[PDB]
Amino acid sequence: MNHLLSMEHLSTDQIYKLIQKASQFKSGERQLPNFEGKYVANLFFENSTRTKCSFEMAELKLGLKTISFETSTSSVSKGESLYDTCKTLESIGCDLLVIRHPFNNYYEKLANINIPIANAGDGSGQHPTQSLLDLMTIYEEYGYFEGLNVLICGDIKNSRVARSNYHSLKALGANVMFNSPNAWIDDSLEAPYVNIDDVIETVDIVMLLRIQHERHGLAEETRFAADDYHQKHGLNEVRYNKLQEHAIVMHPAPVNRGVEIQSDLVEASKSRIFKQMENGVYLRMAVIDELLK
Amino acid sequence: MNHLLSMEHLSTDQIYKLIQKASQFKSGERQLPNFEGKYVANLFFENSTRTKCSFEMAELKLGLKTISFETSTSSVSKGESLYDTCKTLESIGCDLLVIRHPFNNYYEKLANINIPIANAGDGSGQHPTQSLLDLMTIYEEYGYFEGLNVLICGDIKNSRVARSNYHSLKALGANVMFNSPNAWIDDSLEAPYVNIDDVIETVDIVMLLRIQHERHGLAEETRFAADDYHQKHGLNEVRYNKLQEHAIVMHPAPVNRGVEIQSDLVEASKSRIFKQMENGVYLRMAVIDELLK
Amino acid sequence: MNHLLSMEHLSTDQIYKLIQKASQFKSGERQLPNFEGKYVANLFFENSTRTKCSFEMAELKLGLKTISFETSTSSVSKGESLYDTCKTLESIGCDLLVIRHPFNNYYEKLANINIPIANAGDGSGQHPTQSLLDLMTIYEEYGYFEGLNVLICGDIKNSRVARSNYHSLKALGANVMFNSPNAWIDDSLEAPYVNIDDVIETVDIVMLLRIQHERHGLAEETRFAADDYHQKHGLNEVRYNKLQEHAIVMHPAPVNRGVEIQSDLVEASKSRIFKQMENGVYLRMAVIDELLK
Numbered sequence: 001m002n003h004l005l006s007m008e009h010l011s012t013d014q015i016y017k018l019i020q021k022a023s024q025f026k027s028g029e030r031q032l033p034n035f036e037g038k039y040v041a042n043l044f045f046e047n048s049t050r051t052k053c054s055f056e057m058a059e060l061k062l063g064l065k066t067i068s069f070e071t072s073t074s075s076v077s078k079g080e081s082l083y084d085t086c087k088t089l090e091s092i093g094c095d096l097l098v099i100r101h102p103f104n105n106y107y108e109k110l111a112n113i114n115i116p117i118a119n120a121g122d123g124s125g126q127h128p129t130q131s132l133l134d135l136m137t138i139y140e141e142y143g144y145f146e147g148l149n150v151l152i153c154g155d156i157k158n159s160r161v162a163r164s165n166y167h168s169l170k171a172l173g174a175n176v177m178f179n180s181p182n183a184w185i186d187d188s189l190e191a192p193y194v195n196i197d198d199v200i201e202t203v204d205i206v207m208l209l210r211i212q213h214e215r216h217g218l219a220e221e222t223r224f225a226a227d228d229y230h231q232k233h234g235l236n237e238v239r240y241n242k243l244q245e246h247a248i249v250m251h252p253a254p255v256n257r258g259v260e261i262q263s264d265l266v267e268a269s270k271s272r273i274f275k276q277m278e279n280g281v282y283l284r285m286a287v288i289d290e291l292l293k
Numbered sequence: 294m295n296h297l298l299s300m301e302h303l304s305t306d307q308i309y310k311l312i313q314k315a316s317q318f319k320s321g322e323r324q325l326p327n328f329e330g331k332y333v334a335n336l337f338f339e340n341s342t343r344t345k346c347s348f349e350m351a352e353l354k355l356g357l358k359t360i361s362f363e364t365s366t367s368s369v370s371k372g373e374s375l376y377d378t379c380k381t382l383e384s385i386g387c388d389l390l391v392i393r394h395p396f397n398n399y400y401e402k403l404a405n406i407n408i409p410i411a412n413a414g415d416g417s418g419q420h421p422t423q424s425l426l427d428l429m430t431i432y433e434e435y436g437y438f439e440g441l442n443v444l445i446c447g448d449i450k451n452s453r454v455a456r457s458n459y460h461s462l463k464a465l466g467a468n469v470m471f472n473s474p475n476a477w478i479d480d481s482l483e484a485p486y487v488n489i490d491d492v493i494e495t496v497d498i499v500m501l502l503r504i505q506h507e508r509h510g511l512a513e514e515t516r517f518a519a520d521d522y523h524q525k526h527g528l529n530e531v532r533y534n535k536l537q538e539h540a541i542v543m544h545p546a547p548v549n550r551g552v553e554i555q556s557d558l559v560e561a562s563k564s565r566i567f568k569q570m571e572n573g574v575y576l577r578m579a580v581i582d583e584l585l586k
Numbered sequence: 587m588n589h590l591l592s593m594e595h596l597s598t599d600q601i602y603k604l605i606q607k608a609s610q611f612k613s614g615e616r617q618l619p620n621f622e623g624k625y626v627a628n629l630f631f632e633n634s635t636r637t638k639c640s641f642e643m644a645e646l647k648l649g650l651k652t653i654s655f656e657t658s659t660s661s662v663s664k665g666e667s668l669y670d671t672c673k674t675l676e677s678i679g680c681d682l683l684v685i686r687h688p689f690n691n692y693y694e695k696l697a698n699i700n701i702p703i704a705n706a707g708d709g710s711g712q713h714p715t716q717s718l719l720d721l722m723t724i725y726e727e728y729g730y731f732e733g734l735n736v737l738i739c740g741d742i743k744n745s746r747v748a749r750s751n752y753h754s755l756k757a758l759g760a761n762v763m764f765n766s767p768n769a770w771i772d773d774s775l776e777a778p779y780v781n782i783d784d785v786i787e788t789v790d791i792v793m794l795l796r797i798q799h800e801r802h803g804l805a806e807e808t809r810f811a812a813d814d815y816h817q818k819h820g821l822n823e824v825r826y827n828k829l830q831e832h833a834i835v836m837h838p839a840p841v842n843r844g845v846e847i848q849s850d851l852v853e854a855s856k857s858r859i860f861k862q863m864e865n866g867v868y869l870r871m872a873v874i875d876e877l878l879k
């Protein structure tokens with residue numbers, strides 16, 4: 001594990017080792033590693049609160065120091081390529097890069113980078129640390145994946161979260177289903193597309209997605225009606241009350257309250273939305289350990 | 294104390310204890326506390342040099358580590374509420390939030406946050422750390438507040454500094470007076486409005502304010518004449534030369550040289566403007582201690 | 587050395603002492619100094635990747651802590667002058683300022699700053715840490731400067747790098763030559779202006795410059811042709827193949843690949859472009875040591 005770029009690059013063995021290490025860091029069963037003397041740069045070319053702040057928390061707790069990089073004050077405005085930016089940070093003594101970039105598969109331009117890269121998101125491609133922390137949360141809830149009924153609702157084709165989660169849940173033997181507006185069906189993902197109300201009473205995990213407005217074109221954005229989306233594709237009171245006693249609600253965040261989820265359900269008893277954000281720190285510690293060990 | 298949001302929330306006893314702790318940190322009479330292992334996020338949704346950099350100096354000197362948050366690169370652009378931002382930073386393991394936000398009373402939306410909040414400014418509402426460092430500076434100058442004659446000149450109704458200082462000085466038994474253009478009189482603050490030249494010879498403390506151009510409407514901004522404002526409401530040579538031997542000049546900064554104050558008076562003998570910024574570090578150390586103990 | 591503002595302020599003795607200290611830090615011959623307990627602010631009012639990130643790497647490796655300052659979130663929008671910003675950071679307990687600013691000779695407004703200032707670039711004026719790391723790289727390559735043939739190609743009159751390097755190379759007894767489009771000839775620098783192809787076979791060092799598009803006026807930017815610039819002023823395959831066995835290629839970065847340099851030459855055997863970026867960390871450690879000693 002030289003890099004962490006895509007869930008398609010991980011075996012189920014590597015997924016279990018990362019999840020179990022993260023759980024043992026969190027429980028105190030395993031003491032945190034010490035990487036005092038090592039440096040990390042966080043390169044966020046798209047916006048982030050959780051992924052950037054939780055990577056920073058993980059890095060500082062493992063004794064790394066950060067090199068500040070804000071895109072808009074960098075020599076990117078002078079015409080510097082992503083490769084030159086990464087190779088520059090290597091040359092000045094960085095031991096690790098964490099990169100979120102708007103280009104799908106940006107990491108294919110970074111073959112000649114000799115320090116580990118953690119992909120914090122490539123456009124609508126992969127979000128492996130979101131997927132791993134989602135899997136960690138499910139594993140802590142139930143202790144197993146095989147036969148789990150998972151419904152992923154919302155903007156599927158524009159979601160790096162849906163893509164990473166589909167591949168890894170399927171490989172772990174979960175039953176993945178999608179609910180989507182017709183416009184946002186992803187043909188590349190072979191799982192059934194269903195009505196929420198046909199399956200809500202027999203699902204174990206409902207994963208809600210934010211609508212990726214900033215990834216959409218003009219026609220989609222001009223015809224968007226929030227109230228109509230909520231009625232057809234959102235978790236409301238009636239749908240929440242049909243969840244089995246054991247079932248949980250997940251969302252990679254941020255939430256648009258009243259759109260994909262009724263506001264007062266965000267911190268309802270079956271929600272693990274804020275739990276996911278806590279777990280992300282421990283999972284990112286496990287990723288850092290695997291890359292720098 | 295659990296939070297520091299408003300001077301209306303503090304007793305004069307709490308004000309004295311904060312001022313005295315800050316002075317003892319500054320003098321070396323009291324050793325700095327050690328909060329190694331704790332994390333703070335600085336959330337500045339309005340611009341800042343002093344409040345943000347001095348909070349950062351105070352945090353680092355007490356052994357805290359910071360989680361970087363720039364508003365414009367955060368998931369706020371994806372539609373995340375202030376509450377969700379704060380609860381997210383709590384969930385990932387922040388022990389303290391320092392928040393400046395343009396909404397008056399923003400902190401009333403943060404009742405369900407379980408970690409301490411220091412208000413670095415809520416629009417035109419409160420600026421409690423400015424008020425406390427102003428009070429610390431006055432206390433170090435004179436050793437008492439009762440019967441002090443304080444003139445606060447400039448944009449009163451748009452000033453969180455004037456509002457916080459009015460409440461706390463009045464509670465400590467100071468005589469508070471205002472000089473304002475008619476447009477910027479604050480009706481909510483019961484203190485006399487006076488002409489500078491009627492009281493300048495008998496004041497102990499002149500506090501100058503910056504004009505809050507960024508908080509004004511079109512009509513105010515289109516009619517503004519800097520030279521006319523300076524003649525009527527500014528500290529010039531003639532007004533400075535009428536100050537008593539013991540009197541001091543204060544300004545929360547930044548200064549607009551030639552508007553509320555003649556340029557060469559910013560670092561004149563009776564100015565405590567740069568002294569206030571030094572004292573701000575020690576007062577913010579005292580606040581952090583109270584919030585994290 | 588109280589400040590580092592201009593190469594015109596340094597003796598050749600001071601240049602040798604800085605270069606040799608930087609080389610001994612890099613080789614491990616000399617242990618890094620420990621400035622734990624000291625604070626630095628990095629004030630980048632123009633964009634930077636190397637100069638800002640390498641100063642930060644140098645600062646953290648010497649045990650300094652940074653006070654975050656981003657121009658666009660500072661009280662500069664409230665009308666604060668550069669002097670007031672610097673004097674504020676002094677007052678709050680900063681021990682060192684690193685400043686990049688668009689105004690040529692900005693530092694002449696900072697006479698009343700009482701802490702050391704390192705100039706990370708003043709408009710088209712001076713870039714002393716670039717020049718010193720360029721000199722360090724040449725010194726490690728050859729062990730001497732006297733009689734060295736150095737060709738500096740590109741936008742000369744808009745380059746703080748060309749200005750700093752001209753003065754210091756000439757003082758060390760190197761033979762400095764320029765290649766420039768007619769528009770970008772600098773009259774203030776008395777060195778021959780030559781065609782690349784007339785001297786390429788006899789030069790020891792080719793230093794390429796980026797075109798300073800952001801420092802240009804309308805007429806220059808509207809008539810720019812990248813293709814034509816590359817043919818006349820760029821390092822291509824034919825020019826690279828004419829270099830002496832011992833000759834090196836330098837560039838302060840970032841590179842515009844295909845303009846001043848053919849893409850596949852950036853990491854060719856004779857290139858020291860990424861070596862320069864590594865050396866900059868050690869040179870900036872030596873500068874910080876000299877200023878805080």
Ligand SMILES: O=C(O)C[C@H](NC(=O)CP(=O)(O)O)C(=O)O
Pocket residue numbers: 047048049050051052121127130160161209210211212252253254368371
């Ligand atoms: O799912 C979303 O809507 C955004 C999604 N979520 C995150 O990773 C959280 P954040 O943007 O705060 O780091 C992402 O793909 O970036």
Ligand SMILES: O=C(O)C[C@H](NC(=O)CP(=O)(O)O)C(=O)O
Pocket residue numbers: 340341342343344345414420423452453454502503504545546547661664
């Ligand atoms: O009143 C002013 O001029 C600004 C005033 N002062 C400050 O706190 C200083 P700064 O904006 O640099 O943190 C404020 O209310 O933010």
Ligand SMILES: O=C(O)C[C@H](NC(=O)CP(=O)(O)O)C(=O)O
Pocket residue numbers: 075078633634635636637638707713716746747795796797838839840
């Ligand atoms: O030569 C250039 O193009 C810019 C030149 N280069 C640098 O110093 C490197 P950076 O801008 O990444 O700090 C400068 O003058 O800043």
